């Protein structure tokens, strides 16, 4: 039994480490999300003001967007828990072969 509590307590540590990991990735995803909301605003703005907004400032919009793209890439890159890039979108992929996850 005291074996069971030793393994228990270390598993509660592993659970808490879980919570901080999952919350790390989670909060990072909410930051990505906040970007994506601004992005959608930049889609209705890359709506071209329908067509009023000409190629010059379409490229300015593009500067802001691609900037934000590099930011989301930065979220998916920087988010390295214990050095483990959590939001590596290729790291835990269950492809055709499950072992690749």
């Amino acid at each position: 039994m005291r074996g069971q509590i030793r393994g228990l307590e270390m598993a509660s540590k592993n659970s808490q480490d879980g919570i901080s990991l999952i919350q790390t990735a989670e909060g990072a995803l909410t930051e990505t999300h906040a970007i994506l909301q601004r992005v959608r605003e930049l889609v209705v703005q890359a709506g071209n003001t329908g067509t009023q907004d000409k190629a010059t400032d379409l490229q300015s919009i593009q500067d802001e967007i691609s900037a934000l793209t590099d930011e989301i890439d930065g979220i998916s890159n920087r988010t390295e828990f214990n050095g483990k890039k959590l939001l590596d979108g290729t790291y835990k992929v269950d492809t055709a072969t499950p072992a690749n996850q």
Partner: protein, 49 residues
Amino acid sequence: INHNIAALNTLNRLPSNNSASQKNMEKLSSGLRINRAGDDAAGLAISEK
């Protein structure tokens, strides 16, 4: 249990809350949503031309 608690996300809100209020200020003072900042430099540049 009692040595890393500082409401750390609150603490991250506070300068973003202040930041928000200073953006609000900044537009109220000019009376213009157009800021020196290039946030919406498209709309800026449009009304600039």
